[PDB]
Design a protein around this ligand. Structure first.
Ligand code: HEM
Ligand code: HEM
Ligand code: HEM
Ligand code: HEM
Lengths: 141, 146, 141, 146
């Protein structure tokens, strides 16, 4: 459950990301492919080379979806509805993988937000990423 | 893997009573029913729409038999699971693109099926020995991922 | 989300457990301690030997909680509120462990309900134990 | 662990820039803040009432220095972690009753701390190398559990 304080922390941190959201999105994916190579099994159709347009483009789509969820943090289920269906019925990514991407997004934010990444914000972002992951896997079965 | 003599004999003794064809079909069918996202690897298998459809699908039963037959082979080489499964490990990574978490789910479904099939004979200590084996097998199959 | 068929399946299977629920709860714990030894770290104060009365006593408490959950399957958060508080604020069992007990409960049911443990019922029971687990860990942070 | 020569040098090179006592206190405090259930072992430490109280607690900081100092010494034995941590593994299981999942949580929190401390220097490849190390240490610490 995100407390009001959590929502405030997320909004503040994400706000700082600002215009770099897609570039951060791309970096988090590269960090995941390198650290957790089993996640590559879901991208056999992609050029996974560093800076590939496919990864940059996907990074942007992931960032925008996170922006959408931050914007509608009080109603995530409705906000990510479409994405929830896609992942449940077409992509069918094992739920374990969401935890790995979340970790890599946290590391990316840490690496880029020296001032904002306090212990309390880190806690709030971790919870937020867990919630998004839960909404995305909620229609699996 | 590291099995005490008692764990080895428990494993071996039960496996002599397993009809691999039958258990294989049940295990794979239950995986597809209980964790439906696993169906993503079997688009060409036909109808997987209902539990009944999944369970009586002949391509499911056939594949189930192949998988458990290979699994049976590793029971024979418990001391060298990685070496036994290396080729299949590379196949599943490079050609099939199967997330190894699927090996873990199958391991758990298999345990459930042995318990269902054997009842009271599948005691806590027997299960514990099987849990080490399925973890070993999953680890052996994920070994060559890169 | 537990569909009406899931709810039906769960009430039918648990129905058949009936009077043995306590015995099955103890058996599930025993399976868990033998199969996943790290779970023993939460019970340094128990005699974990086969037949231990402490395990049997604890098994009964667990099974009774599950019976109450089945009874209130539409209002689980409120029915399990005190248990969610307990686990979050005192026991503080790592969330990973809930998956291990759930699996052992499924194995126990399989071993005792040959006829009732169909693939459809197995799927409903797995969803149900995941929902119970989510409720029990909902107040952790 | 199996790190290529490149990976080892990357790990060693960043580590040389680390203030062990400081990062230790930070990593342990952040574990207790981000995953509050981990506070269960630390009731004798006093006030863990807020993030500020945790981060500022001298007992937390002292335990963090002790934990990371051990970690640090392990970095010298990348090739023999299981051996290096065997006694500590036993202690953590038999006397302390620490669920090894806690070792995994600490490893992820440590990576986030390094990322926060080093910024752009903590590149994707340096992260990958550190991931292997924290998983290797967690595994080595969980090895003697029974
Ligand atoms: C925070 C969690 C995640 C978010 C917000 C997210 C979001 C998205 C979005 C916005 C798309 C594109 C949808 C479209 O083009 O219509 C997508 C597609 C995709 N996602 Fe997810 N995703 C997440 C986690 C994951 C994970 C963990 C994996 C696998 C490891 C994954 C694998 C995929 C794949 C394979 C595609 C299709 C790529 C393509 O073919 O273009 N996603 N996701
Ligand atoms: C105990 C674990 C497993 C073993 C020993 C195993 C073994 C095998 C073997 C022997 C083959 C046949 C290769 C050939 O002759 O072409 C195969 C193919 C295959 N396996 Fe695995 N398997 C295991 C688990 C899994 C799991 C859990 C999945 C996914 C849910 C999976 C997906 C596949 C697929 C999609 C194929 C190709 C079937 C086709 O040709 O269409 N396997 N496996
Ligand atoms: C479906 C999951 C679970 C349910 C329904 C459940 C239920 C309960 C209940 C009813 C109690 C007794 C509360 C009281 O004393 O009034 C309890 C206590 C306890 N539970 Fe949970 N539990 C679950 C999972 C777990 C897991 C997975 C663990 C650890 C592996 C765990 C560890 C404990 C411990 C250590 C106690 C205190 C035992 C004592 O000292 O008497 N629980 N639980
Ligand atoms: C890199 C991972 C870790 C390493 C290298 C490590 C190392 C150590 C060392 C060197 C000690 C002192 C042993 C002695 O008294 O001789 C210790 C004690 C202890 N550790 Fe661990 N530890 C790690 C992770 C953890 C985690 C994650 C927790 C709990 C969340 C934990 C809980 C404890 C406790 C409660 C003690 C006893 C403290 C005392 O009596 O003051 N450790 N650890």
């Amino acid at each position: 459950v995100l407390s009001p304080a959590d929502k405030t922390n997320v909004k503040a941190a994400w706000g700082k990301v600002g215009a770099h959201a897609g570039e951060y999105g791309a970096e988090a994916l590269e960090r995941m492919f390198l650290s957790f190579p089993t996640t590559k099994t879901y991208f056999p159709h992609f050029d996974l080379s560093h800076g590939s347009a496919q990864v940059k483009g996907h990074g942007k789509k992931v960032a925008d979806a996170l922006t959408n969820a931050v914007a509608h943090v009080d109603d995530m289920p409705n906000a990510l509805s479409a994405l929830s269906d896609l992942h449940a019925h077409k992509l069918r990514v094992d739920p374990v993988n969401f935890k790995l991407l979340s970790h890599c997004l946290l590391v990316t934010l840490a690496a880029h937000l020296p001032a904002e990444f306090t212990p309390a914000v880190h806690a709030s972002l971790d919870k937020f990423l867990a919630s998004v992951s839960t909404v995305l896997t909620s229609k699996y079965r | 893997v590291h099995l005490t003599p008692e764990e080895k004999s428990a494993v071996t003794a039960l496996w002599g009573k397993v009809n691999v064809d039958e258990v294989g079909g049940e295990a794979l069918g239950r995986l597809l029913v209980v964790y439906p996202w696993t169906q993503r690897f079997f688009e060409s298998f036909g109808d997987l729409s209902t539990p009944d459809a999944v369970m009586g699908n002949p391509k499911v039963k056939a594949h189930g038999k192949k998988v458990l037959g290979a699994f049976s082979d590793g029971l024979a080489h418990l001391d060298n699971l990685k070496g036994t499964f290396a080729t299949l490990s590379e196949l599943h990574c490079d050609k099939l693109h199967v997330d190894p978490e699927n090996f873990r789910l199958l391991g758990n479904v298999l345990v459930c099926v042995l318990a269902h099939h054997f009842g009271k004979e599948f005691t806590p200590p027997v299960q514990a020995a099987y849990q080490k084996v399925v973890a070993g097998v999953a680890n052996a199959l994920a070994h060559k991922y890169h």
